[PDB]
Amino acid sequence: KKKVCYYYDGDIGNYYYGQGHPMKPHRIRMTHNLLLNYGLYRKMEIYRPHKATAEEMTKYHSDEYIKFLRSIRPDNMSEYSKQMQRFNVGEDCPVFDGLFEFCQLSTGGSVAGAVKLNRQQTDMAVNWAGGLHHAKKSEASGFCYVNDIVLAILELLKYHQRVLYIDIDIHHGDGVEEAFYTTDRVMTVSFHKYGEYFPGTGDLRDIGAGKGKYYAVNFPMRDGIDDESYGQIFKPIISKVMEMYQPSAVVLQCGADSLSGDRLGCFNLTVKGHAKCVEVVKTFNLPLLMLGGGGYTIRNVARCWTYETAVALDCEIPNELPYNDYFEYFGPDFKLHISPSNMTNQNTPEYMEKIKQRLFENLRMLP
Amino acid sequence: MRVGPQYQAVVPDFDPAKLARRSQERDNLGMLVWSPNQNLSEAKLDEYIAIAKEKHGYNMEQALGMLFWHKHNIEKSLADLPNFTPFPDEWTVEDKVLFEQAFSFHGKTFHRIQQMLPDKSIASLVKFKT
Amino acid sequence: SMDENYFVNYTFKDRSHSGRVAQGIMKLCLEEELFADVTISVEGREFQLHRLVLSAQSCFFRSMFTSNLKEAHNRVIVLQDVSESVFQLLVDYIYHGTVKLRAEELQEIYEVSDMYQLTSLFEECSRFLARTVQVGNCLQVMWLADRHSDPELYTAAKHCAKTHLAQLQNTEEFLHLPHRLLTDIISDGVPCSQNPTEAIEAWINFNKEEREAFAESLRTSLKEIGENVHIYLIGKESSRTHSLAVSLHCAEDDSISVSGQNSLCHQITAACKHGGDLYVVGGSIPRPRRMWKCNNATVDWEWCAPLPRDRLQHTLVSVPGKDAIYSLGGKTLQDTLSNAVIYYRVGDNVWTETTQLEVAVSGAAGANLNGIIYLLGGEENDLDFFTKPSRLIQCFDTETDKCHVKPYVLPFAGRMHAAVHKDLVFIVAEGDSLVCYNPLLDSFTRLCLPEAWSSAPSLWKIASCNGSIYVFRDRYKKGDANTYKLDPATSAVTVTRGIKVLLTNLQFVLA
Amino acid sequence: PGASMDENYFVNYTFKDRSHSGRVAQGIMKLCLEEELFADVTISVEGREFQLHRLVLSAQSCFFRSMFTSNLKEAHNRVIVLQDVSESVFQLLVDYIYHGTVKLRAEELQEIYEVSDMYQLTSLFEECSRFLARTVQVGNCLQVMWLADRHSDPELYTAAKHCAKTHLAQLQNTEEFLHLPHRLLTDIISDGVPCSQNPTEAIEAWINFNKEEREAFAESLRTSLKEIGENVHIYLIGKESSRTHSLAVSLHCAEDDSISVSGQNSLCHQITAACKHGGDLYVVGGSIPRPRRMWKCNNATVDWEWCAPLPRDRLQHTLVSVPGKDAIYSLGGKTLQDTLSNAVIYYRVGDNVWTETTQLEVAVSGAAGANLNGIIYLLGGEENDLDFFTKPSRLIQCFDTETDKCHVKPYVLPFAGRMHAAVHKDLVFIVAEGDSLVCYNPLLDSFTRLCLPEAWSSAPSLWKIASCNGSIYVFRDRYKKGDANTYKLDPATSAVTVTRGIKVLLTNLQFVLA
Ligand SMILES: O=P(O)(O)O[C@H]1[C@H](OP(=O)(O)O)[C@@H](OP(=O)(O)O)[C@@H](OP(=O)(O)O)[C@H](OP(=O)(O)O)[C@H]1OP(=O)(O)O
């Protein structure tokens, strides 16, 4: 019977990255509608996030980068060409109308959730508009401009000695691992696909630098991992991290591109196998901040995030989707749960056991 | 992996005494829109939602926000909806026809669609199956 | 091998025994010609031969010599079904192992090799005949393959006969062929442009006394198919700045025409033409893993499963034998050459991983020959952390999932375009050179391209269709559809017309 | 192999059958032996009649070709008898001529050698000469040397000459050496004999055998008598149980089948690799994380002139000495980033400069190295799999130091993991865990396997191998209390004995170098 808080801004779904861009901010509007029509909206506290000021963003990002983000518009792209080249903005991180407002809303939801958890006013905080884990300190990467996870953790670090960050996106959380690479107050755990893949980092040999050595766990994967293998490897590693690190707050990034049938991912998970991670994390009774992430098949993202929000509330919802404004998006089955494909799992038990044993050896060296 | 002062974040300094000190003040961020009430009955909430829907075209979110406004009391909420009915975006059939023609000419470039539809913002064009 | 030790006793096997024996036989029986024990008289010319070599090379002569008869045991053997020249050719092949094959005496060598049971020469002559089959000799070659029980030559001749059926009707050789050969011709599926029905009526009306009873069976087995010939011309137009995929249809007289177009709204890093469909791989530069599929009928783009890895300048090869599309090699976004091999199952919509290449290359050209992928040229990994042009050939055997590197090298190095014509690969690179590669004989052949276009060092693209090779220019000058038609038999090029789509840039030419 | 212009596959071209020679050979074997057809000559050896074919005999040898052509009476003769060859030897030669494979034995080796020389059977003659040089010893060194003199064989002559020079003391008083020709004795002495043989006494005895005619030759022998130092050495280093300093022990083993300590040296540096080049020791060491300190200073060299450190920081790399180029090659290894390396570098002793070379086909570490006439063999080790970890390897790689090319052999070793290799008489002897010893013949691409004494196999002890003068010594890594467990193996009869008398105090054996 914990308390769950929900952050949502009604205008987040009206921002368009561009034509043919895989990133659709509309996957949060359909998630919100599914939550409303499933009855889970009435079960939590609903907040309208504040717009994070530029001064809050510069707690991590540089002042020049935030100033460029505030100044650039599609109308005046001619005068900033050198600035766009320097800050990695324009090719894959396009300049679109209302970019800074989108960043402000995404950052404000996460920071408000972290503040709410700091004051012991809630046990869980949800923000599906956040979770942009690729943005760097002074440049944009991977559809992300402002790293709100880093700012949320920096808010949490004001009150908690140790914070644990878990990332179940199919991509490496390079923006968050880089920021907290040389500190032991944050341990960054990442499960990701490795080998000629974006972003190119996340090696098993990357364990931390300087004062924060052994405080960066990486679990490289192969193609086609399913629910059974993911469940077999997730619970032991997380239990060992809990035993060794002993954190006081958790930030969980629930990226939905590790589902089956994604437009950009190559895993074979389902909605239940995705939410098993949320179920496992929830058993440790620590403050939790549940953030969004990837996910490029929009209906699957909506289903996964709705089921994970139901899991957080400890509420059961029927497999038959209710009537919502986007009922035509979920046809023709009109079911909440998806079925896996027939791809082969390249993660053989020997490889998985070797990686797990190496990670266990690395975790036992924690001071 | 790049290690440097311009790559990493400046974490605070741990202050054990200052942890459980300031968690009552400063700034609470976000605006409360809805909060559960245990004394409220499920049947009463469902009936209020149904009447708000088939009385003035109030969706679930708007009716829930109105109920939170009147201190979770249904009686003062059933007699306050007609005072200010929330007229939605007024998309006339003419404007829809212009949107369809602009989409046919240009496509999903809302920047160009706004050129011949200047009375609508881009956020209104993105929000606006067949 | 357990009691064998190199200090007391062991078995010594000479690996140079066979070559030494063969060379000694050639040197003894060619230059000096001693120890001749048999005499073969062909058209009045006596050949002093050795029955040991003859019996070791063919079962016909072995049974002639061992199981002796009146003619084969008195003093001499006289052969009457073979002329002097072809018999001298066969003697040269038997004794030396090397023979010069000409198309002017191909059928006679084929028949005599079948008679004397020289199986390797028979297979080579059959491959030559299937290469050079055309309209005028189609039914004659069909007769030859049927009489000599040659399946592959039969299918080659029958495929050539079905696609030119309209021209065959006015010929007596088509009116005189029997019922069964016509069932094999019809059943495979005749294109509608050849008017199979008119051919059937003409054949059945040639002699209506004892042929009308076959009408029902002939009409029931008739098969009509769509447009099986296709070339795709992904490129950029002057007006539309995104892209354009243009379809090309080639008629029976070897003329290309535009049969459709479909603008591409994304940026493309690789393309392929599995079957009659077009597959493109692209998206963005950081993540070039998204895949789409197009059909000329649908005029749309259906998204497929994403690539398991994102690479640049990888090779897309279509293997219709296993119904899959292969992605070999490439260059990662960290400027590192890749040697991974992954294939895509069209029926399942699933990507899978296979064995890796021996050498990691990028920018190579891909060609499929009966289920074997050849990786030609590209970019190799230079020692000093750089990359250099590649001139080696890699052989990925699809059936057994194995990779090999050919000991020989291509005549040229770098980037090139390949096309499979008949059982051969045509390769074109920068420098006005056209190379025909025969992977079964491990040999190359250069066709000289006129130096009229040597001033501009532009890329060249080649595509093949029903008996000719079309060569395309990457850098099209304004208002000039410069496409040339190559005839491999005579190596004569000819400027072609009929293309009226102003493609300023030619990015991909698919089959 | 250029692209032809006068040939096109649609008009006319040249077809060459690559299966012609094999088919011809197989047909010849079948017809001639399984069915015995078309025989045109008869050869009689010791009353045994052979029905052979003149074509097959003339295609293999020039002796038989000139014998058969001979266009006179002696060519067209019914039966030709041969008198210098036994029936069994002729049967073996016929089998070799017709099949291409023969079974060589040491009891008939000299007869086959002579007959193959007489009949111009070049490849059989070369293989017989290699076999004869492999198994030369005291009892036949002079006889083999005189045998190779009549047949003009340089390699066998040098092998027998080295065998006779190394054991001159035993041959000094023998009867055969007394009637040695002057040129043969000059060839023996001028090569350079060890000081333990006492060549002066031998030449004095030879002169005293016939003082009348050999007196004039006395001065030439004294002038041409050159002596050399001791280079037959085994350098084994190790760590004592109670001492943390590695001690390098040098051994000299004479022809009397006895091995003894020649000296000891103490080194206080942890050692990751070592090699024996010439007569002096080369050691690669260093402290973490800079393990590239090549050793130039000790009490035996009394110098400190900074022997060129390795330009790469690697572990478990292979140090192989190539005396032909006076170079030491450092192949493979594992870098500090836990990734296997395929870097090959060499070190010229006179130049004192490390130079990079072409990489290996695969990256390995811990592989055994062996030099066979300028070709380096990397055997075993560990290779990467499940691509963050390593897996034991059973691969063979060759590195030709002349053409600077690397190849991977199609076959694999019978065992995998960590091995120790020793080159003994143009053969590589490889040992590993499991008490199995493997002899490798790279020329024939074949293995033979002896089973070492498995009386003590439960102990997880490593085995080291070092060849010495026709005998192989096997060293036990885990020595017992008071037991210097060393075994001497004679590869001819596969008899393993015990060599008590060598007083090694090293509890743990790190490197055994030869
Ligand atoms: O080509 P993209 O930019 O990646 O986007 C298109 C399309 O957008 P456009 O109409 O601007 O081309 C999407 O529709 P909207 O988001 O604009 O409504 C739609 O994707 P969703 O269904 O996720 O919205 C579609 O994908 P689908 O084939 O699933 O309809 C997707 O991709 P295509 O390139 O395949 O059309």
Residue numbers in the entry:
A (entry chain A): 9 to 375
B (entry chain D): 1 to 128, 134 to 135
C (entry chain B): 26 to 536
D (entry chain E): 23 to 536
Paper text:
As a substrate receptor of the CULLIN3-RING E3 ubiquitin ligase complex, KBTBD4 is recurrently mutated in medulloblastoma, the most common embryonal brain tumour in children. Here we establish that KBTBD4 mutations promote CoREST degradation through engaging HDAC1/2 as the direct target of the mutant substrate receptor. Cryo-electron microscopy analysis of two distinct KBTBD4 cancer mutants bound to LSD1–HDAC1–CoREST reveals that a KBTBD4 homodimer asymmetrically engages HDAC1 with two KELCH-repeat β-propeller domains. The interface between HDAC1 and one of the KBTBD4 β-propellers is stabilized by the medulloblastoma mutations, which insert a bulky side chain into the HDAC1 active site pocket.
